[PDB]
Design a binder for this molecule. Structure first.
Ligand code: NA
Lengths: 237, 237
C-alpha cells in the first residue's frame, strides 16, 4: 500500500532529506525538469527500505519517478539516475534539446552519458561506500577507486580540450550527458575525493559554465532544501 | 595513424581475441546485430592502449563501433557496451522491437538496461579486476563485490517472479535490457563468481529462454572465435 499523500497528477520525483551526500543523483532529474520547465511534485522518502518504495524502485534508492504515460493508460516509473534522465528526455524533451535531435547527436550523447553511468558513477559510489559506509576501512581498495576517478577526469579533460568542444557530447549545447556528469565532476565533489579540481582546468571551466545555468542553480538550491521546509517527509506543497 | 585495413563502408564492431572473460561486453552489440540482421565488419584490436583506438574509444576498451551516418556523408562512433546497444537500436531497430515502441516500453527498458549499466555491470567488472587483474589479492573487497552480485541477482529474480514477466523490461519479448543483462546473469558467469545459479530459478529459466534464441547462439559462437582464425588481428573477412 502507498502512503495516503502519494498521488500521481503529474511527474513525481522521489528524493530523501537534503544533505551533503544525499543529493548528487537526485539533482540530475531535477536539473532536467528545471531546464525543460516540466510540471512535477517532490516526494521526500523517509525510508527507501520501505516495501511500498521497493514497488517503485526495486533497487531501493532515490531518485525514482512515478508519472502518467502520455496516453494516461499506465503509471510509468523511472529508477537509476541515468534512467530518470532518459525518461524525462523521452516524455518531455520534444525537440531533443538535451536528448539529441538525430542519430549522430544521440550517438555522442549516449557515449558520454553511458561513460558516467558505467564508469565515473559506479566508481564514485564504491569510493563513497568503502570510505564511509563499509564497517571495515579497506585503504588499498579506496586508493584504487580514487585513482580510477582521476582516470575518468583525465578522459573528460581530453574531450573538453578538443577544438570547439564546450560540452561533453555536443560542441554547441549541454545534454543529459553533461547533467549526469556535473555532480561528480565539480570542485566540491573533487575536494570530497581528496583531489585538486584545478588540475583539470577545461573540466573545471565546464563545471562553472554548467553551474552558471539558471536551471542548475535552481536545482542545487531545491535539492539541498527538500525535507527541511514546513514538511519533513511525504508530498511537498 | 589508423591501421591500413580499417575502413568504414558499413558498421565496424571492435572486439579483442575471444576468451571466456574477454567477450561478455562485445557479445552484447553482436547479439543485437544478429537479431536485426545488420550488415557489419569485425575488427580484432591487438592493443586497446594503441593511440589510434583511443581516438575511437577514449576509455580504451571494447566493444566500440565506427559506422557511417544515416546520410552516409560522415563517420560516427559508439563505445561502452550499453551505448553500442542504444546506437544500433536508434540506427537499425526502426520498429522498436528491441529499443521499445513507445514511452511506456522505453521507461521499463531504460530502467532494467541502466540497472545493468550502473550496478551488475560495474560490480562484475570490479569483481573480475580485483580477482585476476589487480597486482595484490584483496579478499574482503572481492567478497563484498560477490555479495553485491547476489543482491543484483535477487532484484532480477524478484522481477522475473512477477506474473507474466517473461523478460526483464517487457512481458512479451526481450529488449536491449535483456541482451545487456544476459552475459552477467547466466550459469557459466554465475559459476565464475563462485555462485550456484539454481538459487535464482526464474533468472536461470530466463537465461535459458534467452540462450535458445538463434541470434544469441550465433553471437556466442562467433565472439569466441574472433582472433583465432586465419587472421589474428585487424579487419576479418
Ligand atoms: Na519469469
Amino acid at each position: 500500500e502507498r502512503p495516503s499523500d502519494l498521488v500521481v497528477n503529474r511527474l513525481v520525483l522521489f528524493v530523501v532529506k537534503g544533505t551533503a551526500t544525499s543529493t548528487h543523483n537526485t539533482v540530475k532529474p531535477l536539473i532536467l525538469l528545471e531546464e525543460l520547465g516540466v510540471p512535477h511534485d517532490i516526494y521526500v522518502v523517509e525510508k527507501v527500505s520501505a516495501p511500498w518504495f521497493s514497488e517503485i524502485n526495486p533497487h531501493k534508492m532515490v531518485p525514482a519517478i512515478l508519472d502518467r504515460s502520455p496516453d494516461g493508460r499506465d503509471t510509468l516509473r523511472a529508477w537509476e539516475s541515468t534512467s530518470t534522465l532518459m525518461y524525462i528526455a523521452d516524455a518531455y524533451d520534444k525537440d531533443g534539446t538535451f536528448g539529441g535531435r538525430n542519430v549522430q547527436e544521440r550517438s555522442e550523447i549516449n557515449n558520454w552519458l553511458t561513460l558516467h553511468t558505467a564508469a565515473l558513477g559506479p566508481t564514485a559510489a564504491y569510493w563513497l561506500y568503502f570510505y564511509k559506509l563499509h564497517p571495515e576501512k579497506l585503504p588499498k581498495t579506496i586508493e584504487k577507486l580514487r585513482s580510477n576517478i582521476t582516470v575518468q577526469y583525465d578522459i573528460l579533460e581530453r574531450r573538453l580540450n578538443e577544438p570547439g568542444q564546450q560540452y561533453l557530447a555536443l560542441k554547441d549545447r549541454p545534454t543529459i550527458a553533461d547533467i549526469a556528469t556535473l555532480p561528480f565532476a565539480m570542485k566540491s565533489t573533487a575536494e570530497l575525493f581528496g583531489l585538486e579540481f584545478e588540475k583539470w582546468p577545461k573540466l573545471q571551466e565546464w563545471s562553472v559554465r554548467m553551474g552558471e545555468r539558471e536551471a542548475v542553480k535552481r536545482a542545487w538550491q531545491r535539492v539541498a532544501g527538500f525535507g527541511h521546509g514546513e514538511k519533513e517527509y511525504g508530498m511537498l506543497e
